[PDB]
């Protein structure tokens, strides 16, 4: 008998407005959106060669992780459009009970968090030359302390911090207010205490208690309102306090909703399909996307590279000049709208380095070898040193000279594509240009983030001292990976970061935030698909002729969840390899 | 068909006049209110009291009944507590007609009579029930057809309405999103039982009294609030009944019914009943 | 309460409902839908689903479990009835073989199906998992080229279009057991180098002339080798170098 | 350890679950079996028994 069941597969709603009830079902688009948003049919994983090559449809699943992440972005993409009045809230309820009503709401806490960071970013630009803050604020980890520690006290001692928020709206509602604002006076008095109290060396972003215990106190002194003094030891037991309503359900132990995230797990666990639901969602609400469909092609594959004499940064021009076509062909209509702030333009060297910033290749001292890193010039000859001065001048030029007073982003890109010699200095300067804006978000998207911190094909002799590198080039010295290597989502006002880890080429490769020295909280372990969603997978494919089914296989959908434990790739082998027929 | 003001509605529909006050519509039942028995269920103490006194949570209801009494004897707005249109528009007809007919109303505190008989004064909700699938505004909701009913957990307090068709927006446009969200909408009706010495008397022009004396000194009403939904993605990792313990209140309560005016309210309405029903409307 | 006070003070105004739920067909409501940036882009495919979406909302299960116990999606009733569809079908994959071929000591446990019985003629030095791979990357390639690729590869043979006509009528063909039992229905060699063959010898001899020819092909890799021969049997229902060999032999018998 | 992460190839894997088809009780139970001795093919056929 063949009186088999049918089943519904697709969400009733469109893509911008899903809820938990549609987590299992699929969405659809034309096949043209690939070429429209992703150049030359390169996408995350193998969705083009395998799933699209047969189905001829750009069908996408919804993941538990995917929609939950998309929840956080919709707040960021609403606080911008409709900000909040601090005063009108506390009118409603007493100043005695703020925590149980105000702080612990999901729609209020981010509206507070989302604002304090904007004030923080404005000041960090002063503390960028310092080598120390490169070590602490490369991550978002210690940011979320300083922004939350202010808010936790608002539940404890509102009578000492509540006046700050209230008059901040007086300052915003007062035009002809030339002086700085309260928070931009607050955070300055914080960071000065960091340099004076913290330990210069051995100061880590990944470790909290070592940072708090090195800072016994904050000491604020506002002229108008406050001289409030703080003890940090009380927030040492639980460095990661976060409101229950978000965090039982947002993502497992996920904390930085504004900064970023990271997806790790076994092969085919589903990570390289979640962000595909995000990247498309990112466009249909007109939010900028920075695609990096695979870092394997940048770090574990041949591309031309050239070194600068001052800096160890190996310039790449052909690589950037191909990527920008992808960033352009997708986000063309927005960049025309976007002007430039010429006070920011024109500080990036041709090799990517910036004036104010620390040296991107400092002289390191390997203690165990008892030798410096600069010593590699002993093996050089006279002629090369003479050639270096000839290159030191030829590569001296910057883009500010030949390109003055543009109007949009494309004016930099159309010049960048047209001339190979200035691709990098056009690439990086766009990143400042998108990063300092208040018209459009930033979304930094990576698949294969693991490949970066791994060694590279790119050879050299100067890194022979590192027994791990073994005569290779790290990509934090390669120019183009610098744009995206830094897990700096907090730096982006109205921004977010998403990273993943591909392990198809590896077998049983345990990857996680212990392999990469990486803070806790900002990561999410993947796990396989549940049953009822693993059911519609089969019925979705059978309707679309992806895999060809025996009558033995049409109702094996709830059986293969044993055979796969909810894993995607362990099914695709069966679906395509027909290993069932052996048993 | 056209936009109408607050007072013009009364001046158009309260034109009628009648000599007999008992024949005239009027919600506040002077005489013959019945002591209702307190029902008790499982899912009633879950949200009705949450880190609060059972009484002080009810004392607010004991107060909001009061200004409603004054609001009838005194044409006022600030006193008039938060309540629906379709009752007020049908409750003030029962009052303002007496003002047009020459009758008068006054609020009286009969302390002695309430001391002559009957137990003390106090509010006790004798029925608390949750419902799902509907909103407090009586105009979004459709007929009995499209809704599918689950009368399973009536014994404990729950009823669930689920739609078969697509609901419209302000613009008159269907959605698929709106149906899904409507299936979450929970309302909390409560039937109160508050004995009171304060009463009302009608007094004809040059008449000390024209209404009968009350026997009850007990009066009832219904309050409702459409609740805030839980966090997103909380339904997933929880049992159903453990998920309803997490709805929370921020919207104010809303008087609906009063002394079995209209025999208690109904959310569903036939097609004609919706047409005769009016709602306040903005444009842009 | 803001909207109330405005209406109380005669700031904002009132009128009847323009919105009323009239019985209409599923097609007419398409006019009044609220579509977003995505249904617009792919109209032809979604526009036929609004007819189906709205139909399913009528037929919903009133079961307690899908709403009141844990998270889950309402299902039909066939999902419970057809639970035996696998167990009843997997046997039929095996019912081709008579188990009397295989009742020896502890061989049935390792050789019960047809696919378990081809391999040992092809095993080299005890490797089985390898042979299981090479045969499947080949047979899987057969099904794929017939479905998605062109047929210039399939220009030579004659049974080409006649084979897809046998696929689409029966999804049973994707069982490799049924792919080849079909091939062996063509090829039941009753006689060979002159001797009568019992059923327990007729089956054996058919396979060696396959396994031998797999080793005689010129192509290097087994994947390339093994494909070419199944094509000679699948895509020549009447003909083959191996089948014309057989039909050559009946003439020797009938004349003698 | 996990099922796909110990028995990698599927012919090692269908053997252990060949009874589970014959039962038709799929997903009803939770399995935890501990094995030590021999090689992979011989280590799987024990799981049938």
């Amino acid at each position: 008998h063949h009186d088999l069941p049918e089943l519904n597969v697709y969400s009733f709603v469109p893509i911008g407005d899903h809820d938990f009830e549609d987590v299992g079902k699929y969405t659809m688009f034309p096949a043209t959106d690939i070429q429209k948003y992703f150049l030359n049919n390169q996408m995350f994983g193998e969705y083009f060669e395998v799933e699209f090559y047969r189905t001829r449809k750009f069908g996408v699943m919804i993941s538990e992780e995917g929609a939950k992440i998309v929840n956080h972005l919709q707040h960021i993409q609403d606080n911008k459009e409709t900000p909040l009045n601090y005063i009108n809230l506390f009118k409603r309820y007493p100043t005695e009970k703020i925590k149980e009503k105000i702080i612990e709401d999901e729609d209020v806490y981010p509206c507070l968090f989302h604002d304090l960071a904007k004030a923080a970013i404005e000041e960090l630009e002063a503390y960028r030359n310092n080598t120390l803050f490169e070590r602490l604020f490369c991550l978002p980890s210690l940011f979320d302390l300083t922004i939350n520690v202010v808010l936790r006290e608002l539940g404890e001692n509102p009578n000492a911090l509540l006046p700050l928020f209230l008059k901040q709206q007086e300052q915003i509602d007062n035009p002809q207010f030339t002086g700085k604002k309260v928070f931009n006076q607050l955070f300055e008095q914080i960071f000065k205490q960091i340099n004076e109290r913290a330990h210069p060396e051995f100061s880590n972003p990944q470790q909290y208690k070592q940072f708090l215990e090195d800072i016994q106190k904050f000491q604020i002194s506002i002229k108008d309102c406050t001289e409030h003094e703080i003890d940090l030891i009380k927030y040492c037991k639980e460095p990661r306090w976060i409101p229950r309503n978000i965090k039982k359900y947002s993502l497992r132990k996920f904390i930085g909703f504004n900064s970023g995230a990271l997806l790790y797990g076994d092969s085919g666990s589903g990570k390289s399909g979640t962000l595909l639901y995000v990247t498309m969602w990112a466009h249909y609400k007109k939010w900028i996307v920075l695609n990096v469909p695979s870092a394997f092609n940048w770090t574990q594959k041949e591309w031309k590279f050239v070194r600068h004499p001052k800096t160890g940064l190996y310039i790449q021009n052909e690589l950037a000049q191909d990527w920008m076509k992808s960033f352009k062909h997708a986000n063309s209509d927005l960049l025309k709208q976007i002007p430039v702030n010429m006070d920011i333009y024109g500080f990036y060297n041709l090799s990517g380095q910036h004036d104010k910033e620390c040296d991107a290749v400092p002289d390191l001292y390997y203690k165990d070898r008892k030798v410096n890193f600069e010593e590699h010039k002993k093996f050089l000859t006279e002629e090369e040193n003479i050639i270096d001065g000839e290159t030191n001048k030829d590569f001296r030029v910057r883009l500010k000279e030949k390109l003055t007073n543009p109007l949009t982003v494309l004016d930099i890109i159309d010049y960048g594509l047209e001339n190979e010699f200035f691709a990098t200095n056009a690439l990086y300067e766009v990143l400042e240009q998108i990063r300092n804006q208040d018209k459009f978000c930033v979304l930094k998207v990576i698949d294969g983030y693991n490949f970066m911190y791994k060694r590279s094909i790119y050879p050299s002799f100067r890194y022979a001292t590192d027994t791990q590198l073994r005569s290779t080039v790290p990509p934090y010295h390669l120019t183009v990976p610098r744009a995206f290597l830094n897990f700096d989502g907090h730096k982006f006002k109205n921004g977010f970061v998403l990273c993943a880890s591909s392990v198809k080429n590896f077998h049983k490769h345990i990857f996680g935030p212990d392999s990469i020295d990486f803070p806790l909280g900002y990561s999410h372990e993947m796990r396989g698909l549940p049953l009822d969603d693993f059911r519609v997978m089969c019925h979705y494919y059978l309707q679309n002729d992806f895999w060809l089914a025996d009558n033995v296989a049409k109702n094996s959908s709830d059986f293969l969840w044993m055979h796969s434990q909810g894993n995607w790739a362990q099914a695709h082998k069966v679906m395509l390899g027909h290993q069932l027929d052996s048993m | 068909k056209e936009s109408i003001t607050w007072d013009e509605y009364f001046n158009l529909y309260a034109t009628n006049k009648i000599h007999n006050i008992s024949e005239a519509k009027f919600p506040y039942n002077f005489r013959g209110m019945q002591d209702f028995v307190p029902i008790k269920k499982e899912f009633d103490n879950m949200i009705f009291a949450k880190g609060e006194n059972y009484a002080d949570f009810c004392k607010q209801f004991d107060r909001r009944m009061v200004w409603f009494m004054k609001s009838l004897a005194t044409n006022k707005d600030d006193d008039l507590p938060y309540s629906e249109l379709n009752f007020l528009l049908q409750a003030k007809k029962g009052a303002e007609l007496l003002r047009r007919n020459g009758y008068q109303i006054n609020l009286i505190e009969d302390n002695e009579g309430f001391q002559k008989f009957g137990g003390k004064k106090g509010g006790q909700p004798f029925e608390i029930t949750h419902i799902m699938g509907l909103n407090s505004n009586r105009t979004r909701n459709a007929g009995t057809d499209a809704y599918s009913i689950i009368r399973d957990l009536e014994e404990k307090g729950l009823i669930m309405f689920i739609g078969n068709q697509l609901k419209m927006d302000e613009n008159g446009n269907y959605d698929f999103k709106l149906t899904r969200d409507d299936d979450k909408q929970m309302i909390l009706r409560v039937h109160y039982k508050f004995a009171t010495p304060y009463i009302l008397q009608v007094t004809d022009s040059s008449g000390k009294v024209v209404s009968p004396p009350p026997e009850s000194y007990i009066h009832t009403a219904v309050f409702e609030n459409q609740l805030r939904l839980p966090p997103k993605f909380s339904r997933l990792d929880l049992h159903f009944l453990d998920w309803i313990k997490l709805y929370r209140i921020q919207n104010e309560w809303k008087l609906v019914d009063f002394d079995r005016f209209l025999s208690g309210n109904k959310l569903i309405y036939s097609e004609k009943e919706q047409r005769q029903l009016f709602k306040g409307e903005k444009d842009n | 309460m803001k909207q109330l006070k405005k209406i109380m003070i005669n700031k904002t105004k009132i009128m009847s409902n323009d919105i009323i739920y009239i019985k209409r067909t599923y097609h007419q409501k398409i006019v009044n839908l609220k579509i977003y940036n995505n249904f617009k882009t792919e109209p032809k495919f979604y526009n036929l689903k609004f007819i189906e979406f709205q139909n399913l909302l009528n037929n919903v299960n009133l079961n307690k479990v899908f709403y009141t116990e844990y998270t889950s999606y309402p299902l039909e009733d066939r999902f419970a009835t057809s639970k035996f569809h696998t167990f009843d079908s997997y046997l039929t994959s095996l019912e081709l073989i008579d188990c009397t071929f295989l009742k020896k000591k502890f061989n049935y446990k390792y050789k019960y199906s047809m696919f378990t019985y081809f391999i040992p003629f092809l095993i080299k030095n005890g490797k089985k998992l390898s042979t299981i791979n090479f045969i499947l990357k080949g047979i899987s390639t057969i099904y794929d080229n017939l479905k998605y690729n062109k047929l210039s590869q399939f220009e030579s043979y004659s049974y080409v279009n006649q084979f897809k006509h046998y696929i689409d009528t029966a999804d049973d063909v994707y069982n490799i057991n049924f792919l080849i039992h079909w091939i062996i229905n063509i090829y039941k060699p009753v006689f060979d180098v002159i001797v009568y063959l019992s059923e327990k010898n007729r089956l054996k001899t058919a396979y060696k002339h396959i396994s031998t020819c797999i080793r005689q092909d010129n192509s290097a890799k087994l994947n390339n080798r093994i494909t070419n021969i199944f094509l000679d049997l699948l895509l020549n229902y009447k003909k083959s170098y191996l089948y014309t060999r057989k039909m050559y032999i009946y003439e020797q018998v009938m004349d003698m | 350890e996990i099922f796909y992460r110990y028995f990698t190839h599927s012919y090692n894997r269908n053997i252990a679950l060949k009874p589970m088809l014959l039962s038709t009780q799929y997903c009803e139970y939770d399995l935890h079996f501990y094995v030590r001795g021999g090689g992979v093919m011989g280590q799987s056929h024990a799981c049938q028994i």
């Binding site: 549940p530 | 990792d237 | 079961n63 479990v65 116990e69 844990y70 299902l75 419970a80 | 009803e28």
Partner: peptide
């Protein structure tokens, strides 16, 4: 019943819920 849910997102159908040809030959013989 027909279906019951074990736990979060795990639906399964529940399972814990005169030959004539002989009638002839028994007559003939």
């Amino acid at each position: 019943e027909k279906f019951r849910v074990l736990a979060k997102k795990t639906t399964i159908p529940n399972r814990r819920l005169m030959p004539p040809i002989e009638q002839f030959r028994t007559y003939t013989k």
